[PDB]
Every structure is written in structure tokens, then in C-alpha cells.
Design a protein around this ligand. Structure first.
Ligand SMILES: [Mg+2]
Lengths: 85, 205, 79, 79
RNA sequence: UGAAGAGUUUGAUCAUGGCUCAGAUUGAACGCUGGCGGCAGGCCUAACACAUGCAAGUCGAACGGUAACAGGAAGAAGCUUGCUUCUUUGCUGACGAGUGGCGGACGGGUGAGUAAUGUCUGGGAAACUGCCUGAUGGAGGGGGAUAACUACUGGAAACGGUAGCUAAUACCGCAUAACGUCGCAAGACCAAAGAGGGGGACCUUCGGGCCUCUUGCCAUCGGAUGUGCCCAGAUGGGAUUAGCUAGUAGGUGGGGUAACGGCUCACCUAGGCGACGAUCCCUAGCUGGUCUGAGAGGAUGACCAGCCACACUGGAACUGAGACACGGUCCAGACUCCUACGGGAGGCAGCAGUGGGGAAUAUUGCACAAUGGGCGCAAGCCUGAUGCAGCCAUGCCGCGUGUAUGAAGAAGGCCUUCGGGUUGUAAAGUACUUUCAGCGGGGAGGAAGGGAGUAAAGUUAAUACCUUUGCUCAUUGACGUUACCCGCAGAAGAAGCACCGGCUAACUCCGUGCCAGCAGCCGCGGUAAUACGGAGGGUGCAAGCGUUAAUCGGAAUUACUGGGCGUAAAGCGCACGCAGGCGGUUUGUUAAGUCAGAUGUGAAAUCCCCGGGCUCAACCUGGGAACUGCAUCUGAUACUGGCAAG
């Protein structure tokens, strides 16, 4: 309905495309780490994990998705790769 | 909101004289007391049980001029206060503004003093009061304001109630504009005919 | 330490989980009579160190499962 | 964002407020953490038309409560 | 500091019982009558459909801006030779739209849904918290574009697509790294911003660094405050609903949320709840309290206040500190609306109104002046929340509609046994006063702030600025031709309504004659009606009175305090008994039952007692007591209860 929401609502569509497109970039470096755990490898599983550790907090401090959900991925992923090899 | 048309025929209903018309020969029958309540006048009043309670509630209402909404508020106030329910009910009646202005000399009758309350004349303790139930606290002066000190009827009133009994619980200057609600009017210095049993036992249900 | 709510064991057909009833008196609120009333609440315990019919001391804890937010502390009765 | 605003429990054309240490976003007068102090603009030598117990504001300033205008009148309209 | 009953079964009576009545109260409607003022109240029914106005905007002290206004500059000029006609100038105040920031997630309105983790009380840990607050520390450098606009082209509108051009606190990199996150350690990794004010020096392309103040911006640890989550107790009817349940119940795991979690997906285990009432259908929002009752107890949840639930009907989510989002988006439909037929707009359970169903419930009100809110460096904007005014006896508490005197006990009305009586001191006539309304004139407080000046020990350039304190002027109300006080008329504008056999306070006559009619029960009317209809007189109440509807009370008539059952309704036809309820007798002992003591806590407002303020009272109000409660420590062992011994 007619208000000054179009300043806000279209911006929520601007922040729909711009934000969610960067979410798959986070999820891309989620997948290959889980692929490396599935691969049985150990050395390259250190590579993409140490690669994604800035990639996590670059979109966890200010950006998309925040508040220690990203920061607890550093725990359980590290807990698996030590149990593998 | 008061009883207007006749006045003494209501005394012919309730037996003894209620002080509505007084000071003159109408004490002894200028209206034939006990002879005509109405058309069927001097008749056989075969009384009942509920009657001898119902007459008393409309005795002391009609001696002061208080209708039924207002008189129950004096009753319900006379339960929360400490002491006898009946005696506080007579104490709360005597502290009424109109009842004080009458028997502190002023006015011929209570209905006149009520009109003298309601016509801006009386003044309680330095304060104008035109409400006929400003219920006076002890050690307070009554006073008539200056612009109605002597108009017609003030000076002829004191002499009539001076043959009446001078009551203990008030002080009064017959000279001018000075009274004192002294202390609580007890049961002894009442009119002594009113039976407080027959009102407390009426409203209790 | 809360009150160390004493209770019993009713049944154990579950995997590291028991059922505890609790004896409890009360004034009946309108008649004034003492009805012995009992409740029924699931209690977490790992060792299966209490059997069906014991007497159990219980405190609360973090809500672990569904329907069960009480850990065992110790047992004061054999079967 | 806790505030020290004033409520309104008066008659018609006869206001009589209440000194109310409450939240910002809540009601006109429907909610408070606690209540201490009162007010009246009908004093005219009735009695004290203000009585506040200033230590409790000195408590709740120490928490960090931002204070409002007509109370900020009162803290100098009392000594 | 508190407790009343009476009428009717029968020819009479003692009992048993019902039905009915006296009381108190309402969001009330209807009938009749109606003068004022204060306080509070006013779609309970279709949550059914909505004309039209309005109910969320703000910062130029983030940005390019310049389309509008206003001040100027510059030039052309009304030449009006100095008074002002225009254009360049974003030059500035200031500002429409668009980027950006925060807030629209509160305030509001409704009670349709929800018998439940929804509410209410008393406990708990496994987490976040925009703004406000405590302390410490940080706060380097770049880059990519793009609407807006420009020029163009699609559509009927709504709207659509391009290249150009510039910004940022828009965003993307990059430098930096704990008392931070991951990690046992070792290690590894992550962040950002300017903006105004003012100038002491120097410099300067004269932009500005430079100095200072204010203030944001970053990270962490606190403190509050708000919100998610858990536990136990307590919360409508129906057992002519007794079985229910597989993601169900539990455990390793991954995965998942801010957080524990069956919150989800594979795997194993086979459970879980239930007569102390599960699933089921029906009905309902819950509490503080209101009403009534002497009390217990009983019906209620409108108003003001707490907490959830819902936005035309079903869904799913985006952003965000916070929503699954009332005046935002999408998917459908449904109505509804509009169309060049291709398409677009719609949501009053916001305030004010129409349709309509209705017994019935109101104005297409005024102001930002108050107190609160939002945005802000304030000014100020905005606010159909609040502050007020009209509407309506709906209710409460006042108040007047005159008071004296006065009979010849008047004409008059009916009664009359024709002796009279009564209305009735009532009226008349003499006395007397104007409350309120009419009408006239002055006339408190709800106003503090703000803005302007001017002073101070402030901190820095010691006097710039700003922050704080005190002083000075001008001030700033919708209500409101206010409350209240004062002035003058002239008894002058101001009395209805039911009942009159019994309960139940008040009675006689005409008319009608089992017809017309009354009525709450008992009942009245078939020629003398204290009951129907009418008239005098009386009663009770009063600006209202009756009637109906609705809850408790009387009802000891669902009885725990407070009943009964041999015949008045009522002892299963009779037996052992399961779960239930209940202990002979002595000692020991524990301390759950209970008693005691405190300490928490029971939100404030109503109820209650002493006290203040409206000329009193309703009403507004200070402090107390009370909130009968639940949870904890300490104490007590007589009763009771589990263990031990007889
Ligand atoms: Mg003023």
C-alpha cells in the first residue's frame, strides 16, 4: 500500500540479490572442505580450511550472516579433520 | 428534591408534632392533630409490625428534610465508624449544616435555614457554604456574611428557640455571627422519643 | 542441590532413561483433606546404576532430550 | 533506554502525575520497573507538591537510565 | 463489628418439598414524564461488505543536488541616477523528488481462533540484546561502479529497457590484532568513518593540513532493560468419547538454530502417555479485580492495567538488533475494482463515518498548548495514541423547582348516614430571599520549558568556541465568550411515576355484570367488585419512575463451616476382593505432614483504617495494614507419617 516503504522495500530487494549471491560464495568453500573430508585427504583439507578461515569472518563480522554461527564452524570442522588423518 | 405542598398534615400522619410550623399557636391544633391524615380522617389505624419500624424511618427523615438516596448514605456511613451504629447515626444527623443553623438560633424553621443555606447567606469558619450537608466538625464557628446580617427575619428567631432548651453541645452568641460546635451530642441530650432501634433494624437485611 | 527431590523408579524399558514418581502431600483446596498425590517425570541417567523399584535423589539440569530435564545424583536404595 | 518519565492518574482538568522509572517504548501509563516519587500541579499550599526520594534516582542514574524533561525540572525545583 | 423472612398443596394441623416475592447490582433496551451542573460511561449482534477523508515520518550537521521558495553576489536593466526590473551564481539560507541512515517489529484496534509450555504463581541455565551505561584498547591505505539526471525507444495506464555522467557513513578489496573466536597447547584468522564549531602560531595550489572541543564510527569485558528457552504446581463442560501414538519414545552420530534441544536426515533401541481421565467432539481468550455473600462459596473478564493470539482467505519466506510483518513483497484464489481486453489497483479486528443484520450503542469535532513516543546537535516535524469539545437521564454524588404568616377553617371537587366531612394552612391575601438557569461585568491555575541576552572556579589560545551553574527581558494553551467571585430583575423558567385484597407502607364511591379486563404467586369478574374500567383521597420514591431481560442473595434448594436416606425422592438382591481411604500397643529415630521464627517474594491501581485536596459528596489522593500465597534457612518433638526394635 502507499507509504514511504518503497525506499525500504525495494532496498530489501536490493539486499536480497546482493546478499544471497555472496552466500553461495561462502557455501562454495563450505562444500570443497566437506568434499576433502569425504575424499579421505588430509593435506588439502588443511588448505581449503585455512583458505576459508578469513572467508568465514569476512562475511561474519559485517556482511551477511553473523553471531557465532560462522564462528562455531571453526570448532566442529577442526574436530572432524583431526579424527580422520 | 424535597417535600413541597402541605406540611402539617404529615405531622397528622406521624402522631406527635414535627417542627415544620412552630412558635405560634399551631402547637395546639391549628390543623387538628390526630384527626385527619386524609379523606378517611379520624379513623381506626390498626397498626402492624413493619409499620412501627417504617414510621420511624420517616420520622427523622421528615424532621430534617432528607430523601431516601441521601439518608441511606448516612446509614452506610454509620456502620464503618466506631461505636454504636444507632448513636453515630444520630451524631451524623446532628452534625449536618442545616440542623446546626436551626438550633443555633438562626431561622424560624429548618426549611427556612436550608433556604438560608442555599441563598449564599451562611458562612462556615470563614468559608462560604451553599450546600446543605457540609457536615460540621467540632470547634468551628458559624457565621452569617455581612451583606445579609439584618434583612427581615434574623432578629425574631432567637427569641422563639430561647424558650426551647439551650443545648449543651453548642455555644452561640445571641448578639452576632458566632457559634461553636462544642462536642459530640450524646443520647441524653437528644429529643429522647426517637428510637434508634427502629432504623438500624430496618435497613439491615 | 535444590531440595534433593526424593522419588522412586516406576519402569525402565528405555535406553539410559528412567521414570520417577514422587510422593507428595497437599491440603485439598476446598475440603481440607490430605490426598497423597504423585507426579511422573523422566530422568536422565547413564550407568543404569538404579533398578526398577529403588529410591532416587534428583536435581534439575539442562534440558537434554524432549520430555526429560532431570539428572540423577545418587541412589539410596537397592531393588 | 530506561526512562524516568511521569504517568498521569488524574481527574478531568485535575492532573496528578506519578514519578515513574520505566521503559521507553512502553505505554502512556501502564508499565514500570518500579515507582518512586509523585507530583502535583495543584499544590497552592496543599502540602508538598513534590516528594521524590532522590537516592533512588541516584541509584537508577548509576545503572544508566536517561532522564526526562519534567523530572529534570523537578531536580532543581527541589533542592 | 457480623447472619430477619413471608405467601400457596389440605376442610383444618405438624413435617417434607418445590414454584413465587421483599434485597443488592448492571456496557442494558422499551413506555411515559423531564430543569440544571461535576465525575465516569457508550457496536455486547455479521471477524459481513465497505463510499470519502485521515491513522508514520524524519536528518542538508551522510550524498551528488537545484526544482521550488527566500536573501544576496555578478551582469543586463524597471533608470525609479539609486530606488529596485531580470538573468547568470547552488552563492547561501533553505528544500520537492532519488541514493543513504535509522524507525515503520512500538503506540493503537479487535477477541475470530487457542483447553494448550496460552496465562498465573514459585524455582532454573544453555543464549542474544538496536538505542542508554562502566572500564580498557583500537580507529592505515586504496579500488570498482551506479541510479538520480541526460539523450533516446516499449505500453492504454500502471509501467519498460539502454549508453553517458558523480558522490558517500553507499558498498568491494587491503594494511593492523586481545583480557576475542577455533585450538589441549603450539598455531592460524577476523574490523573501521567521518562530521561540524572555533582559531594561538606557521605554512598553503590558499583548497587546507595544523591546534582544540563536541560527537559518531571498531573490538572485547561488564552493568542494566527488553526478549527467546526449561522445570513443577493451578487453570471449561461431555466417559451415551477408553484406548492413543511412529518422527512416535529413547541413544550414538552427522546436519541444524543466537541458544539446550528429535529442530531436522540416515542408523540402532521399542518404546511413550493413560482411571490422579489420554485421544475425542462441543464451548471459551487468561490474571490483578468488578458483583454478590456476615463468611466460606457462587456467576463474571466491558472500562483503566499485565500477557499472548490475529490483520480479506490459505501458504512460504526477504530484510532486520528485533517480524514470519495492520496502513511492506511473492504464490494462489476469493470477492472486489478497472481496462484500447493486452493489463493494473484493491483490504476500516486504526479514529470519524455508510450499507446491513439489529431491542439498541454517538461526530465525516478542534489543537500540538500539556504528559509520553519516533527521527534528530537542536530548533522543529509528526503523532484520529493521549489533552479536550459536541451527542444520549445509561449510571453514580450533589442541587434547585421558594420560605414566613394565614382560615371565614373560602368558593371548588367527591364522600354525605344530608348532622356534615375532607382536600386543607392547602390555596387566596399579606410578609420575605434569589441558589441554579436567564442576563451583565471583571476574573485563579493546569507553564514548566524553549528562545534571547548576561554573569561563574570550568577546559583549552589566559579571555575563541562550546558544556554546566545563577541572573535579565520578551514570552509561549486546544479547552476558552473556563472554573470561581461580583451586578440587576422578579415567585418570577423548573414535578412527575407506580401502587392502594394478602405478602406489601395506603380506601372509599360511580360505571360494567363469568362480557369487556387484570395479574409476580395466591387469584378476581355470573348487579351493591377496598383486585376490572373511572373519579376524589391516600401511600412510596423523585428528575426520574415503572416493566422486561441478566447474575448472585433469601435457598441449610449440591450443605467443606451448613443437609439427608424405617414409611416424605434415596441402602446395589448377595458375596469375597485389585488399585484407592483408614490404624492396637511400647521404645528408638528421622523431620516429609504440621507448628514457630525470620529472610525472600506476592507489580501499582481498587477493597480497608488514620490523613490531605475539589465551597461538601461522588471523585482525585499521602502513608499504613491487608494480598489469606508460594520457595528457602533456623527451631520444635506432643500428634501424625517412613525406617529400626518389641
Ligand atoms: Mg498560566
Amino acid at each position: 500500500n502507499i507509504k514511504s516503504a518503497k525506499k525500504r522495500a525495494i532496498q530489501s530487494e536490493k539486499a536480497r540479490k546482493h546478499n544471497a549471491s555472496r552466500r553461495s560464495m561462502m557455501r562454495t568453500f563450505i562444500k570443497k572442505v566437506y568434499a576433502a573430508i569425504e575424499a579421505g585427504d588430509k593435506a588439502a583439507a588443511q588448505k581449503a580450511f585455512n583458505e576459508m578461515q578469513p572467508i568465514v569472518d569476512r562475511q561474519a563480522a559485517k556482511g551477511l550472516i553473523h553471531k557465532n554461527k560462522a564462528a562455531r564452524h571453526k570448532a566442529n570442522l577442526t574436530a572432524q579433520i583431526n579424527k580422520l588423518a | 428534591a424535597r417535600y413541597l405542598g402541605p406540611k402539617l398534615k404529615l405531622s397528622r400522619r406521624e402522631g406527635t408534632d414535627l417542627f415544620l410550623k412552630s412558635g405560634v399557636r399551631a402547637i395546639d391544633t391549628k390543623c387538628k392533630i390526630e384527626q385527619a391524615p386524609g379523606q378517611h380522617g379520624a379513623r381506626k389505624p390498626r397498626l402492624s409490625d413493619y409499620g412501627v419500624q417504617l414510621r420511624e424511618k420517616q420520622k427523622v427523615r421528615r424532621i430534617y428534610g432528607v430523601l431516601e438516596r441521601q439518608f441511606r448514605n448516612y446509614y452506610k456511613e454509620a456502620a464503618r465508624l466506631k461505636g454504636n451504629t444507632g448513636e453515630n447515626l444520630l451524631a451524623l444527623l446532628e452534625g449536618r449544616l442545616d440542623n446546626v443553623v436551626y438550633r443555633m438560633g438562626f431561622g424560624a424553621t429548618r426549611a427556612e435555614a436550608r433556604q438560608l443555606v442555599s441563598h449564599k447567606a451562611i458562612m462556615v469558619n470563614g468559608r462560604v457554604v451553599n450546600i446543605a450537608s457540609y457536615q460540621v466538625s467540632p470547634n468551628d464557628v458559624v457565621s452569617i456574611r455581612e451583606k445579609a446580617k439584618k434583612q427581615s427575619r434574623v432578629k425574631a428567631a432567637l427569641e422563639l428557640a430561647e424558650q426551647r432548651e439551650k443545648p449543651t453541645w453548642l455555644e452561640v452568641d445571641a448578639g452576632k455571627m458566632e457559634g461553636t460546635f462544642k462536642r459530640k451530642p450524646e443520647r441524653s441530650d437528644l429529643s429522647a422519643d426517637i428510637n434508634e432501634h427502629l432504623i438500624v433494624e430496618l435497613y439491615s437485611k | 542441590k535444590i531440595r534433593t527431590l526424593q522419588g522412586r523408579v516406576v519402569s525402565d524399558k528405555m535406553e539410559k532413561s528412567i521414570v520417577v514418581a514422587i510422593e507428595r502431600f497437599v491440603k485439598h483446596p476446598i475440603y481440607g483433606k490430605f490426598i497423597k498425590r504423585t507426579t511422573k517425570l523422566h530422568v536422565h541417567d547413564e550407568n543404569n546404576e538404579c533398578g526398577i523399584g529403588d529410591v532416587v535423589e534428583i536435581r534439575e539440569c539442562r534440558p537434554l532430550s524432549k520430555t526429560k530435564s532431570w539428572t540423577l545424583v545418587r541412589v539410596v536404595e537397592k531393588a | 533506554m530506561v526512562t524516568i518519565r511521569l504517568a498521569r492518574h488524574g481527574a478531568k482538568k485535575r492532573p496528578f502525575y506519578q514519578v515513574v522509572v520505566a521503559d521507553s517504548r512502553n505505554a502512556r501509563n501502564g508499565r514500570f520497573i518500579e515507582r518512586v516519587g509523585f507530583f502535583n500541579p495543584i499544590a497552592s499550599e496543599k502540602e508538598e507538591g513534590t516528594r521524590l526520594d532522590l537516592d533512588r534516582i541516584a541509584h537508577w542514574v548509576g545503572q544508566g537510565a536517561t532522564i526526562s524533561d519534567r523530572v529534570a525540572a523537578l531536580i532543581k525545583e527541589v533542592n
